[PDB]
Amino acid sequence: EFDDDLVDAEGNLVENGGTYYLLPHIWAHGGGIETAKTGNEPCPLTVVRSPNEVSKGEPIRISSQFLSLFIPRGSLVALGFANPPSCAASPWWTVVDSPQGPAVKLSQQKLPEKDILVFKFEKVSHSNIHVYKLLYCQHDEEDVKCDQYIGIHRDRNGNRRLVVTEENPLELVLLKAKS
């Protein structure tokens, strides 16, 4: 096939295992990704988008299921904070079901790879800069199916929570962070 690797905001291939800021395509739609303490959580375990348009949010490690230097765009990826809240057991995002639908969270325990290698970036056509939607990939049986998008749900407190969405998937540009 043709790998068609993920490309960062500056036109360079995304490095596998590298750290990037996950910024909105549209400048006015907020900043980078952060965490917040919501519901009955004991500590910041909810993944959210910063409301500060100038904030790059946290550096996020993007890792594929492969050893490769770059990331073919049809690859499943795990996403983790380079510097997670102290209470999370690992940096990796996971998706948790809920009365309102699947939500993106951190965990207080280490999870198996099949619970964190659950994302995929999907190229957005009609764009000059490389813009991606973020898919969530649920189990199909003995495999995985990437048929749901991640979007934003603003809660009664203003947190812009990352959750599985039906409409208005979010759109990101990946900006390499200083290491």
Judged on CB neighbours under 10 Å (0-12, 13-18, 19+), 4 is exposed
First to last CA, the chain: 32
The vertex-138 CA angle with 81 and 78, nearest 5°, equals 20
The CATH number of the domain where 161 resides is what?
2.80.10.50
Question: 174: Cβ–Cβ under 8 A, 6 or more apart, which residues?
Answer: 6, 7, 8, 9, 14, 20, 21, 22, 23, 62, 130, 132
Do 70 and 5 touch, CB atoms closer than 8 A? yes
Question: 9: Cβ–Cβ under 8 A, 6 or more apart, which residues?
Answer: 23, 129, 130, 173, 174, 175, 176
Give the residue from 155, 82, 80 showing the smallest Cα distance to 113.
Answer: 80
Helix (H) or strand (E) holding 135: strand 132-139
Residue 170 neighbours by CB distance under 10 Å: 22
CA pseudo-torsion sign 47, 123, 23, 159:
negative
Give the residue from 90, 85, 78, 73 showing the smallest Cα distance to 131.
Answer: 73
Structure-block tokens of residue 2: 């043709």
Structure-block tokens of residue 65: 């299921």
Question: 141 lies in which domain range?
Answer: 1-179
Specify the pairing of strand 132-139 against strand 171-176: antiparallel
Number of domains in the chain: 1
The vertex-40 CA angle with 34 and 41, nearest 5°, equals 40
Declared resolution, Å: 1.9
Method used to solve the structure = X-ray
Residues in the chain followed by a break, C to N above 2.5 angstroms: none
How far, in Å, are 13, 64, 113 from residue 138 at the CA level?
27, 16, 13
Give dist(CA 77, CA 93) in Å, integer: 10
Q: Tokens 């079901």 identify what position?
A: 97
Structure-block tokens of residue 61: 């490690």
